[PDB]
Amino acid sequence: MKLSLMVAISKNGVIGNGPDIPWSAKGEQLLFKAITYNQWLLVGRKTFESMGALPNRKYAVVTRSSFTSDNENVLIFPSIKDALTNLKKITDHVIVSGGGEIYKSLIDQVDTLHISTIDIEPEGDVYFPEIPSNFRPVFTQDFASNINYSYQIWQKG
Amino acid sequence: MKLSLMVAISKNGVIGNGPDIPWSAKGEQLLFKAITYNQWLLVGRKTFESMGALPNRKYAVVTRSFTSNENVLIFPSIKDALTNLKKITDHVIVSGGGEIYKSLIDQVDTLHISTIDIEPEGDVYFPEIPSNFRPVFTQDFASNINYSYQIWQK
Numbered sequence: 001m002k003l004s005l006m007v008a009i010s011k012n013g014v015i016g017n018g019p020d021i022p023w024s025a026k027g028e029q030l031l032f033k034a035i036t037y038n039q040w041l042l043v044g045r046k047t048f049e050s051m052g053a054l055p056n057r058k059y060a061v062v063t064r065s066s067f068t069s070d071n072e073n074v075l076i077f078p079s080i081k082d083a084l085t086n087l088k089k090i091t092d093h094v095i096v097s098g099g100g101e102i103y104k105s106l107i108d109q110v111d112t113l114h115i116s117t118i119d120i121e122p123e124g125d126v127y128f129p130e131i132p133s134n135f136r137p138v139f140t141q142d143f144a145s146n147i148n149y150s151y152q153i154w155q156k157g
Numbered sequence: 158m159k160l161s162l163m164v165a166i167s168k169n170g171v172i173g174n175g176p177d178i179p180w181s182a183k184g185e186q187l188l189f190k191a192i193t194y195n196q197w198l199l200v201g202r203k204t205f206e207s208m209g210a211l212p213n214r215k216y217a218v219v220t221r222s223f224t225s226n227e228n229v230l231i232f233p234s235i236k237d238a239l240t241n242l243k244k245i246t247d248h249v250i251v252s253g254g255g256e257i258y259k260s261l262i263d264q265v266d267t268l269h270i271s272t273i274d275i276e277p278e279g280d281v282y283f284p285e286i287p288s289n290f291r292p293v294f295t296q297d298f299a300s301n302i303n304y305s306y307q308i309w310q311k
C-alpha cells in the first residue's frame with residue numbers, strides 16, 4: 001500500500017484555527033477534489049467532524065473514543081495502526097488528509113506529498129511538520145486567485 | 158514561458174470521435190478543472206468551438222479562417238499565439254485538440270496524461286511522446302470507467 005498526504009499550508013505555517021481552515025482560496029479546493037476522487041482518506045476525528053462525509057470519497061477515521069458514524073462510506077478505527085492494517089486488505093492507496101495530529105503521526109510513513117502553499121498569513125493554532133529530508137519536489141504550478149496559491153508534489157527518495 | 162499539455166487518452170490511443178470525447182469517466186474532469194484554474198489554455202478552433210469557454214479560464218485560440226468574450230484571444234497561427242502569450246503570461250497549457258497536440262508536443266515541458274480504461278470508436282489520436290519525457294507521478298482512480306493520471310517531465 002502506498003500512502004499520499006494532501007494539505008494546504010499558509011505562508012506562516014498555519015493550517016487550522018480550531019475547527020476551521022482560516023482562508024478561502026478560490027480554486028484550490030479543486031486540487032483536493034480531484035486528487036481525492038473515489039479515494040480512501042485517512043483523517044483524524046476532529047477533521048472528520050468539521051469536513052463531514054463528502055460525496056465520492058471513502059473515509060478511515062481514527063478516534064480513541066466511542067465516536068461513530070452510520071455512513072456506509074465511513075469506517076471508524078481505534079488507532080492509526082488498525083486503520084492501516086485494515087485498509088491494506090482493500091486498497092493499495094490511502095491519502096492522509098489531516099488534521100495536524102494525523103499529519104504529525106504519519107509524515108514519516110508517506111510516499112508522496114501534495115502541498116498547496118497559500119499566500120496568506122492567518123491566525124491559528126494548528127501547524128504542519130517539517131518535510132523530511134528525503135522528499136524532493138517533482139512538479140510545481142502557480143495559481144493566481146483571490147488568494148494566490150502554489151501547488152507542489154513531492155516524492156520520497 | 159513554460160508550456161504544459163493536458164489530455165485524456167483512451168487505451169487504444171483515441172482522444173476524439175468527430176467533435177466529441179467518446180467516453181465519460183466520472184471524476185477525471187476534476188483533474189482538468191483543477192490544473193487549468195485561472196490559467197491560459199492554448200486550443201485549436203475545433204476544440205474551442207466544440208467545448209465553449211469554461212469560466213475562470215483564459216483562452217488563446219488558433220484559426221486559419223473565426224471570432225469571439227474578453228477572456229478569449231484569437232490568433233492566425235501558433236507562432237503568433239506563442240509570441241503574444243510570452244508577453245502576458247509565464248505559463249500556457251496546451252489543451253487540444255489532436256492537431257494542436259501534434260504541432261506542439263515537441264515544444265512542451267510538462268505532460269498531464271490521464272489514461273482512460275476504454276476502447277472507443279473515434280478518429281482523433283494523440284501524437285507519439287518524445288523519448289525525453291519521463292513520468293514523475295502516477296495515481297490510479299476507480300470509477301464508472303477507470304483512469305490513471307500521470308505527470309511527465311521533459
Ligand SMILES: NC(=O)c1ccc[n+]([C@@H]2O[C@H](COP(=O)([O-])OP(=O)(O)OC[C@H]3O[C@@H](n4cnc5c(N)ncnc54)[C@H](OP(=O)(O)O)[C@@H]3O)[C@@H](O)[C@H]2O)c1
Binds near residue numbers: 006008009077078
Ligand atoms: N489542508 C489544511 O489546511 C487542513 C486539512 C485537514 C485539517 N486541517 C485542520 O486541522 C485541524 C484539526 O487538526 P487537529 O490536529 O486538531 O485534529 P485531527 O488530527 O483532525 O484529529 C485529532 C483526533 O484524532 C484522534 N487521534 C489522533 N491520533 C490518534 C491515534 N494514534 N489513534 C486513534 N485516534 C487518534 C483523536 O480523536 P478523539 O479525540 O476522538 O480520541 C484526536 O483527538 C482543523 O482546523 C482542521 O480544519 C487543515
Ligand SMILES: NC(=O)c1ccc[n+]([C@@H]2O[C@H](COP(=O)([O-])OP(=O)(O)OC[C@H]3O[C@@H](n4cnc5c(N)ncnc54)[C@H](OP(=O)(O)O)[C@@H]3O)[C@@H](O)[C@H]2O)c1
Binds near residue numbers: 164166176203207233
Ligand atoms: N481527450 C482529450 O483530452 C481531448 C482534449 C481536447 C480535444 N479533444 C478532441 O480532439 C478533437 C478535436 O481535435 P482536432 O485535431 O480535430 O481539432 P483542433 O486541434 O481542436 O483544432 C483544429 C483547428 O485549429 C486551427 N489550426 C490548427 N492548426 C493551426 C495553425 N498552425 N494555425 C492556425 N490555425 C490552426 C484550425 O482552425 P480553422 O479550421 O478555423 O482554420 C484547425 O481546423 C475533438 O474530437 C475533440 O473532442 C480531446
Ligand SMILES: CCc1nc(N)nc(N)c1C#C[C@@H](C)c1cc2c(c(-c3ccc(CN)cc3)c1)OCO2
Binds near residue numbers: 077078086
Ligand atoms: C469493501 C470495503 C469497502 N469499500 C467501500 N467502497 N466502502 C466501504 N464501506 C467498504 C467497507 C467496509 C467494512 C465492511 C469494513 C471493511 C474493512 C474493515 C472494516 C473494519 C474493521 C475493523 C474495525 C474496527 N472497528 C472497523 C472496520 C470494515 O477493515 C478492512 O476492511
Ligand SMILES: CCc1nc(N)nc(N)c1C#C[C@@H](C)c1cc2c(c(-c3ccc(CN)cc3)c1)OCO2
Binds near residue numbers: 163164177180204269
Ligand atoms: C476529458 C477532460 C479532459 N481531461 C484531461 N485530462 N485533459 C483534457 N484536456 C480534458 C479536456 C477537455 C476539453 C476538450 C473539454 C472541455 C469541456 C468539456 C469536455 C468534455 C469532456 C467529456 C465529455 C463527455 N463526452 C464531454 C465534454 C472536454 O465539457 C465542457 O468543457
Ligand SMILES: CCc1nc(N)nc(N)c1C#C[C@H](C)c1cc2c(c(-c3ccc(CN)cc3)c1)OCO2
Binds near residue numbers: 020029032050097
Ligand atoms: C480544500 C482544502 C484542502 N486543500 C488541500 N490542498 N489539502 C487539503 N487537505 C484540504 C482540506 C481539507 C479538509 C479535510 C476540509 C475541511 C473542511 C471542509 C472541507 C471541505 C472540502 C471541500 C468541500 C467542497 N464542498 C467542502 C468542505 C475540507 O469543510 C469544512 O471543514
Ligand SMILES: [Ca+2]
Binds near residue numbers: 079080081082
Ligand atoms: Ca496508532
Ligand SMILES: [Ca+2]
Binds near residue numbers: 235260
Ligand atoms: Ca502547425
